[PDB]
Amino acid sequence: IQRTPKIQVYSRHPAENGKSNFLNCYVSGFHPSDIEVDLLKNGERIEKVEHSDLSFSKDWSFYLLYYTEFTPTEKDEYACRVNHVTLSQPKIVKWDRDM
Amino acid sequence: VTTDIQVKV
Amino acid sequence: SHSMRYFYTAMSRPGRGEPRFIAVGYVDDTQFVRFDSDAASPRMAPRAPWIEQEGPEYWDGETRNMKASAQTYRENLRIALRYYNQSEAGSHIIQVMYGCDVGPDGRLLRGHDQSAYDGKDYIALNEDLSSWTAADTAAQITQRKWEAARVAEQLRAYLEGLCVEWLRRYLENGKETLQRADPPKTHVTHHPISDHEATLRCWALGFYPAEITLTWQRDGEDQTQDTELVETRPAGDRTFQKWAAVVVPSGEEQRYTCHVQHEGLPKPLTLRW
Ligand SMILES: Nc1nc(NC2CC2)c2ncn([C@H]3C=C[C@@H](CO)C3)c2n1
């Protein structure tokens, strides 16, 4: 069976411009396990992004946390870009510091 | 600690 | 009031090498070990501070067990393929979860050993730790083989034995973190979306364990049909986050209260913007 990933983009700590932090993209609820996840800075792929070890939930769907160090500013935009076999084209979710 | 048990389905 | 769980995933990938095997271990909501067969040099590895003290015989032994289990699961993928008359050109997944729940006294509450094939239930050990539930005819084959080979008896001996005992050890070694609830830091934010409406978002941050309830009330009444609840999510520092939001008429914010239940909280919280 296959399931489409849920996506949340958010910071480890409350965002304060000029202060270092971590940008997270949490993908969950998906199946099968192959997935492509990029963090974007103003539309451009961030190179050194790490992720958690693959695990799964009670209903067998998978989840992963992708993350990297960032220092938020007023004008820099961030996003998470996800592709999965259940998706016709990559899905981009923008970072909203209020979410 | 993990289990050592090895079983074939 | 505690559990230890291991999560194994084996994934075939024709054209991309032998099947990949990944194992992770948790005590409660804390990951403490990992194994990935695709690592440059595959080993069981620590993922929580309190497991690092385990000696070389633990790490060497866990690494050997993981390498053996990977091989066994690769074989079981081949067997499942035959049960289901599927092509070798297709990719498939076995997922297996097992482990034990213990009570406050440190004794076994319930043992677990259940699995899925391509994300559907395959076979599960029942609570008696003596019988099986098979979800289809392929798993029914497995079920007969396992009764003949006393597999449930073997699992039961692990679950009643080493599982419970090592869980007890880990909980002692990591008592400062595993037996301490971290209450959420909470606050309400306000975001105008027009001249007539605004969003009230109730935040819970930095809590452990993951279990939590956030609810919005209007005039002391449940707004469940109208609340935007996000899935509890990892902060990345072993703590969790959640928020709940409601859209309210501008000016009527004081009609709304956010209610927070968490184990680290002496009393439930009532918040308002
Ligand atoms: N329910 C279940 N399904 C399995 N495989 C089916 C889905 C193809 C399976 N393989 C091994 N075990 C137990 C034996 C040792 C423990 C760790 O491996 C678990 C299993 N339990």
Structure characteristics:
heterotrimer; A: 99 residues; mainly beta; Immunoglobulin-like; 5-stranded antiparallel sheet; 4-stranded antiparallel sheet; 9 strands; elongated; B: 9 residues; little secondary structure; binds the ligand Nc1nc(NC2CC2)c2ncn([C@H]3C=C[C@@H](CO)C3)c2n1; immune system; MHC; antigen presenting cell; T-cell receptor; human leukocyte antigen
3D architecture notes:
The complex is a heterotrimer of chains A (99), B (9) and C (273). Chain A is mainly β. Chain A has a single domain (1-99), classed as Immunoglobulins (Immunoglobulin-like, Sandwich). Helices cover 0% and strands 47% of the residues of chain A. In chain A, the strands form two sheets. In chain A, strands 1, 2, 5, 6 and 7 form a five-stranded antiparallel sheet that branches. In chain A, strand 8 and strand 9 form a beta hairpin. The relative contact order of chain A is 0.33. With 9 residues, chain B is mostly loops. The N and C termini of chain B lie far apart (23 Å). Chain B contains no helices and no strands. Chain C has 273 residues and is of the alpha+beta class. Chain C is built from four helices and 17 strands. Chain C has helices at residues 56-83, 137-148, 151-173, 175-178, and strands spanning 2-11, 20-27, 30-36, 45-46, 93-102, 108-117, 120-125, 132-134, 185-192, 197-207, 213-218, 221-222, 228-229, 233-234, 240-249, 256-261, 269-271. In chain C, the strands form three sheets. In chain C, strands 4-3-2-1-5-6-7-8 form an eight-stranded antiparallel sheet, with helices on one face. In chain C, strands 9, 10, 13, 14 and 15 form a five-stranded antiparallel sheet that branches. The A-C interface holds A 1-3, 6, 8, 10, 12-14, 22, 24, 26, 28, 31-34, 52-56, 60-62, 65, 67, 98-99 and C 7, 9, 11, 22, 24, 26, 31, 34, 36, 47, 91, 93, 95, 97, 116, 118-121, 189, 191, 201, 205, 230-231, 233-237, 241, 243. It is classed as immune system. The entry lists the keywords MHC, antigen presenting cell, T-cell receptor, human leukocyte antigen, drug hypersensitivity, abacavir hypersensitivity, repertoire-altering small molecule, immune response, immunoglobulin-like beta-sandwich, immune system. It forms a trimeric assembly. The entry is titled "The crystal structure of a self-peptide complexed to Abacavir and HLA-B*57:01". Chain A: Beta-2-microglobulin. Organism of A: Homo sapiens.
